[PDB]
């Protein structure tokens, strides 16, 4: 059972979403990319038909527009079980105490 | 049942009181494991244990007992646990975490993630992004104010947030690329996000792409494969480090990928096995 | 630790994931947002009951961490009342759904405007022989020490012109003054006390270059240590004084507020010339007689409206401190 699962490879135009579909769906977080400023909504195209809505995502044309903060919250909050802390400075607090 | 919590607090208080060096060791671990957000080695643990015992002149406690006490106290107050890390040579040659004999460790909070509170987390983190860099600007001396985080906000730094987002997208690219991607190919895909590939420092992080990848490797998120070859040159491919394997679980990755594409929970079927098929042998399990 | 200790874990994680400083209204919102799963609906609860439960949880966490060498101190901000409540367009909880400044409330409709105290995460071990490693190397630690030196040194001034910058503190002070009495006369005393003066003076530092100093200070502000006012001047944030309450009060003699166990850096500092005793060389409330905005409002409103420092009039009072 597990032998077949592990042996199978990826990047062969797999049914629902491939690597390109995965990355463009990740780019789908356009709540600020153009929705907020340009006010232009995605052009809706109305198993393989599910990825027809992701072709237009390849028009990033720049970096700063995309919302990196949101994904930065997805990670370190949802997954990774992040034990993040403040990391307060110690050397400033230490006293010589001669 | 209700008194279980209180008796556990009393027990951990007795343990830490009887083991004063445990407090110092927990402080040092919680500090060093985050100063660089890197892995901690068994040799370093042994050295710090001996140094603390000699300084406090108390009999050197057993390593297993110290490890158990640290894990218990962290679970009680911080919820953190020092889960074991499989040896890096296992892949290059359910597994219970050999904490008593694992070579390396890393802090990890064991509190189970809820279903929708993380939604509030991400909403608070991302709400202000529209005004942090509105019109392509940025906070700092370049503007007359620096209180864009208000008195306080969940955005935290906005320097580590972008770093974590880049890490997540890099892992997503690598995980589903048959857990093997060439360095040049990785740069090519990353260029689709607008990151300068000419060597110029990126805007938010202020770090070059090559330096960013070097830091990522130094933090053990991804391990470089220096497959030197005369015909193909010094081709380098990136694998998933053991840190991510013991840090990004299969269920956590499934939830992440599901909520990136925003598919309804009803159609979660055929996804758990699909993700396992796509990842392949990225995990030593 | 079936369900009860999970709430404590989540509250600690939320308070400690905000770089150690976060807003009490945010803590209450998070506590509701968490308990909504503990006991189903979680609707038969009052705001005062929520605050009491949050205080009990914080006390439990504080007693737990005290033996571990950590504490969660509650420190009142220099600003108070609706001035801190406004934040950025009051509390966050257009063409896109992202604009929800006044939506997605925890209940159908609930507001928590009252807000006066901040929660901070610090450690009480002043020596701290264990936690020496830090992302900041000795050079920027020395830079931090020198900067804080200048921030507290700049608090003493001889005279300032009648140029009232429209800051968020001065407006609240004027609001309190008019609330006490709507005279609207020339009671706005001209003298300015500034503990937050960024005027390229820091760039005069020697060891580090201008670009490195700029980057380091930007990172420090990003870590919620030094805050930049609208005019472009630098100032230490609430967390900075919260962590260094003993260090600032020990290595210098900065006057304490009306509270006998708390420190103040912004508000009103009458001073005049009848300072207590003589100290060494400085006066103007060198040793005591300083008040926060909320403390100032409490003291003026209640009995003894006139300052107790040998007696003074409200006209000579109101020495704005920034």
- SSE class of chain C: mainly alpha
**What summary fits the major beta sheet of chain A?**
none
**How many structural domains are formed by the residues of chain A?**
1
Structural class of chain A: mainly alpha
**Tally of separate domains of chain C:** 2
**N-to-C order of helices and strands of chain A:** HHH
Number of strands of chain A: 0
**N- to C-terminal separation of chain A?**
70 Å
Major beta-sheet overview of chain C: 3 strands, antiparallel
Please state roughly what percent of the residues of chain A sit in beta strands, choosing from under 5%, 5-15%, 15-25%, 25-35%, 35-45% or over 45%: under 5%
Order of helices and strands of chain C: HEHHEHEHHEHEEHHEHE
Largest interface: A-B, 50 and 73 residues
Gross morphology of chain A = flat
Counting DSSP E segments of at least 2 residues, the number of strands of chain C comes to: 8
Give the overall form of chain C. globular
Rg over C-alpha atoms of chain C, rounded to the nearest angstrom: 22 Å
Write down the oligomeric state. Answer: heterotrimer
Q: In percent terms, what proportion of residues of chain C is strand?
A: 5-15%
Structural Rg of chain A: 22 Å
Helix content of chain C: 25-40%
Describe this structure in words.
- The PDB classes it as cell cycle.
- The entry lists the keywords cell cycle.
- The assembly is trimeric.
- The entry is titled "Cryo-EM structure of Nse1/3/4".
- Chain A is Non-structural maintenance of chromosome element 4.
- The complex is a heterotrimer of chains A (98), B (285) and C (322).
- Chain A is mostly helical and 98 residues long.
- Chain A has one domain (2-78).
- Chain A has helices spanning 2-7, 19-26, 68-78.
- Chain A is flat.
- Chain A starts with a helix and ends in a 20-residue tail after the last helix.
- Chain B is mainly alpha-helical.
- Chain B folds into two domains: 3-109, no CATH class; 159-279, Orthogonal Bundle (Arc Repressor Mutant, subunit A), CATH 1.10.10.
- Helix content of chain B is 50%, strand content 9%.
- Chain B is built from 13 helices and six strands.
- In chain B, the strands form two sheets. Chain B has a three-stranded antiparallel sheet. In chain B, strands 4-6-5 form a three-stranded antiparallel sheet.
- In chain B, helix 1 crosses helix 4 and helix 2 packs across helix 4 (63-78).
- The longest helix of chain B has 17 residues, at 160-176.
- The relative contact order of chain B is 0.09.
- Chain C is mostly helical.
- Chain C has two domains: 4-122; 138-321, no CATH class.
- Chain C has helices at residues 4-16, 24-38, 47-66, 82-86, 138-153, 168-180, 210-222, 238-243, 245-251, 293-301, and strands spanning 21-23, 71-76, 117-122, 192-193, 226-228, 234-236, 267-268, 320-321.
- In chain C, the strands form three sheets. In chain C, strands 1-3-2 form a three-stranded antiparallel sheet.
- The longest helix of chain C has 20 residues, at 47-66.
- At the A-B interface, helix 2 and helix 3 of A face helix 2, strand 3, helix 6, helix 7 and helix 8 of B.
């Amino acid at each position: 059972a597990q032998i077949s699962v592990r042996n199978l490879k990826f990047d062969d135009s797999r049914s629902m979403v491939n690597l390109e579909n995965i990355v463009n769906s990740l780019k789908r977080y356009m709540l600020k990319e153009h929705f907020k400023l340009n006010n232009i909504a995605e052009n809706r195209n109305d198993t393989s038909m599910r990825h027809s809505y992701l072709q237009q995502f390849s028009h990033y044309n720049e970096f700063s527009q995309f919302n990196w903060f949101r994904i930065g919250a997805l990670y370190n909050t949802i997954s990774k079980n992040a034990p993040i802390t403040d990391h307060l400075m110690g050397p400033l607090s230490i006293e010589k105490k001669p | 049942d209700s008194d279980v919590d209180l008796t556990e607090d009393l027990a951990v208080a007795k343990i830490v009181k009887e083991n004063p060096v445990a407090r110092k060791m927990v402080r040092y671990i919680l500090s060093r494991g985050e100063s660089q957000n890197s892995i901690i080695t068994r040799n370093k643990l042994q050295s710090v244990i001996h140094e603390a015992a000699r300084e406090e002149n108390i009999a050197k406690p057993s390593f297993s007992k110290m490890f158990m006490d640290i894990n218990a106290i962290l679970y009680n107050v911080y919820g953190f646990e020092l889960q074991g890390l499989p040896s890096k040579n296992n892949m290059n040659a359910m597994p219970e975490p050999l904490g008593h004999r694992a070579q390396k460790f890393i802090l990890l909070n064991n509190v189970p993630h809820s279903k929708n509170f993380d939604d509030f987390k991400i909403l608070q983190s991302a709400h202000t992004y529209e005004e942090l860099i509105v019109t392509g600007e940025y906070i700092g001396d370049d503007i007359a104010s620096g209180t864009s985080n208000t008195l306080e906000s969940k955005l935290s730094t906005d320097r580590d947030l972008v770093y974590k987002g880049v890490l997540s997208v890099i892992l997503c690219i690598v995980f589903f690329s048959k857990n093997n991607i060439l360095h040049q190919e990785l740069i090519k895909f990353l260029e689709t996000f607008g990151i300068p590939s000419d060597g110029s420092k990126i805007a938010i992080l202020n770090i070059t792409i090559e330096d960013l990848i070097k830091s990522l490797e130094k933090r053990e998120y991804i391990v470089r494969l220096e497959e030197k070859s005369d015909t193909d040159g010094e081709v380098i491919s990136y694998r998933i480090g053991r840190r991510t394997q013991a840090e990004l679980g299969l269920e956590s990755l499934e939830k992440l990928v599901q909520e990136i594409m925003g598919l309804e929970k009803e159609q979660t079927k055929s996804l758990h096995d699909d993700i396992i098929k796509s990842i392949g042998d990225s995990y030593s399990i | 630790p079936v369900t009860g200790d999970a709430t404590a874990k989540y509250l600690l994680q939320y308070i400690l994931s905000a770089r150690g400083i976060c807003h009490e209204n945010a803590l209450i919102l998070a506590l509701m947002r968490l308990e909504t799963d503990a006991s189903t609906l979680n609707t038969e609860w009052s705001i005062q009951q929520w605050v009491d439960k949050l205080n009990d949880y914080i006390n439990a966490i504080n007693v737990k961490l005290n033996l571990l060498g950590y504490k969660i101190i509650r420190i009142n901000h220099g600003i108070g009342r609706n001035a801190v409540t406004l934040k950025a367009k009051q509390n966050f909880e257009n063409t896109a759904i992202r604009a929800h400044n006044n939506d997605y409330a925890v209940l159908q409709s609930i507001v928590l405007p009252e807000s006066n105290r901040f929660f901070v995460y610090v450690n009480l071990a002043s020596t701290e022989e264990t936690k020496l490693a830090t992302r900041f190397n000795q050079n920027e630690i020395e830079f931090m020490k020198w900067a804080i030196e200048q921030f507290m040194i700049s608090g003493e001034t001889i005279v300032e012109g009648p140029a009232l910058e429209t800051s968020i503190i001065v407006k609240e002070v004027n609001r309190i003054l008019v609330a006490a009495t709507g005279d609207s006369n020339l009671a706005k005393w001209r003298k300015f006390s500034t503990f937050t003066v960024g005027s390229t003076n820091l760039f005069q530092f020697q060891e580090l270059t201008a670009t490195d100093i700029e980057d380091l200070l930007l990172r420090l502000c990003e870590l919620k240590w030094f805050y930049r006012t609208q005019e472009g001047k630098f100032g230490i944030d609430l967390r900075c004084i919260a962590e260094l309450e003993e260090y600032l009060t020990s290595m210098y003699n900065l006057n304490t507020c009306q509270n006998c166990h708390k420190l103040a850096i912004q508000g009103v500092r009458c001073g005049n010339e009848s300072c207590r005793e003589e100290n060494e060389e400085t006066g103007e409330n060198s040793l005591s007689q300083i008040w926060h905005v909320d403390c100032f409002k409490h003291y003026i409103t209640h009995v003894s409206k006139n300052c107790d420092r040998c007696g003074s009039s409200l006209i000579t009072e109101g020495v704005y401190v920034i």
